Amino acid sequence: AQRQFFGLTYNFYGQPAPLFDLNDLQELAGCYARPWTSRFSHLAISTGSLPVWSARYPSVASRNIVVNTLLGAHLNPFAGGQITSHQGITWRDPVLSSLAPVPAIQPPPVWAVAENVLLDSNNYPTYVLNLSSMWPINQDVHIMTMWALSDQGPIYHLEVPVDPMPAATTAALMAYTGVPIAHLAQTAYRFAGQLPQSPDSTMVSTIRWLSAIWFGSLTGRLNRSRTCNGFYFEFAKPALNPDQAVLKWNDGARAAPPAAAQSSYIRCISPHWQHQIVEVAGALMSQSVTAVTGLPALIDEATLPAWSQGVANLTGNGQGVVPCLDYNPVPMAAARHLQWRQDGLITAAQEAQLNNDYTAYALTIERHLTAMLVANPIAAGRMPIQPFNAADFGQAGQTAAAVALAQAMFV
């Protein structure tokens, strides 16, 4: 299958120890203190449209943002070989399941707190000699890596071949029809995180084809009148829950396979991704693919945070790197509505209408995060919000280039 994941631990943002305390270990949903196979656990049972977030976890990406620093704080293996222990907490045994208090009689060595520790994976020989059991850990660490190599939104990866969708892909995809993007992220992740799959498996090339097929919809290029291969995502009114996507199937005028491969990493600069279940789902839904199949190439050092500068085997700067086109939710959806008007889906009156109904919605996202960062600073201890600063929220980077990527990805 695959066994060689190069990771990278979360940044401290200038804080002493990793941003999380003792209580985070016995609060995680699902399997006790087991951080593995968590993420989409608090969403296992849907009650309604309202995004699941409590007091300690003020947002959607709050559950994951916490399991990240909690994850890295206990990742001496792959980066040292030992098991160590942070604040009296360690793994049960070599398989690395749930975290229990440091066992007596033979306690592990105390972990040396460090920021951004490069994970080699092969450094821990027990991993490959017990792959079929500790496989989820590979998918999860990969997630933490994509989240760590960015101070503003998880950097996933789109692709799309030069030729049309395989004959085994079109038959597998016709099963995730009436399924929201929020759920596609849950089924995608829970798939690549329980049993060692192959890089050329049917469910892998289809889930990847489902992610890049989602980006076009998010940009508006793959609407109701322009399918990639009969699949798209119908968006509801932004004032009436814009989180709803669903992979609808039609028989309209399909697009056409591009002249070349459109491999490209994408990011969401705007801190809006934090509270948007749709953005967090789109990110983690793509990460499920780069898990079973390590990074197709290296990531561009063009922008990114000041700590992801020249990583071991993650972010480069030469010619073997792939540019990262980052966008912004508000301008992206503002350009997404503009696509619908061009082909005649919406009236020229609903053009400037959907913009005001969405910008008001995205405002609620901004009014929420700003009010949560102040409530939960950073020097306090944890980092459920991630210090984004209020100077941003609307400084859209090359979002205009991400849109031009979708037009090129589906000619």
Binding site: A29, G30, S41, H42, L43, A44, I45, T47, G48, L50, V52, S54, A55
Partner: protein, 146 residues
């Protein structure tokens, strides 16, 4: 709204954004009438645990008293749980408040657990605390107001 794999059941707050029970709630009485079945099953078990002080906000209610004896021990929970089980979307029973009978001497008292207690000073008909007693000692002396 209930939450999966061991997560607190969120109580849909006013703004219409489910919040969590362990806190301080303000219960617009009417709400509490078409909702007790819930109240008693999620917030109540919470208040007893002593982790969710709630203010039932009802304008002017009828109020039943119940004088118990500070000597002996008592836990005001059931004289409340019962009152809850008598609230329809129709009508609520006169709010019952337990009150220790004011003693004459300085008696040793058993730690009782109480829950119901009004904000406004509704003690306006007490008149007297220990008519015949030469002096109330543990109860709340309430000399005949001149």
């Amino acid at each position: 709204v209930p939450r999966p794999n061991g997560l607190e059941p969120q109580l849909i707050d006013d703004g219409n954004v489910p919040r969590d029970i362990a806190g301080d709630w303000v219960y617009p009485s009417d709400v509490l009438q078409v909702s007790v079945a819930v109240f008693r099953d999620y917030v109540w078990p919470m208040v007893k645990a002593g982790r969710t002080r709630v203010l039932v906000e009802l304008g002017h209610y009828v109020y039943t008293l119940h004088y118990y004896d500070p000597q002996i021990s008592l836990d005001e929970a059931p004289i409340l749980e019962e009152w809850l089980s008598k609230i329809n979307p129709a009508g609520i029973p006169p709010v019952p408040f337990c009150i220790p009978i004011p003693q004459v001497y300085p008696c040793i008292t058993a730690r009782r657990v109480h829950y119901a207690f009004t904000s406004e000073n509704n003690n306006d008909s007490l008149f007297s605390t220990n008519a015949a007693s030469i002096d109330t000692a543990f109860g709340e002396n309430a000399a005949v107001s001149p």
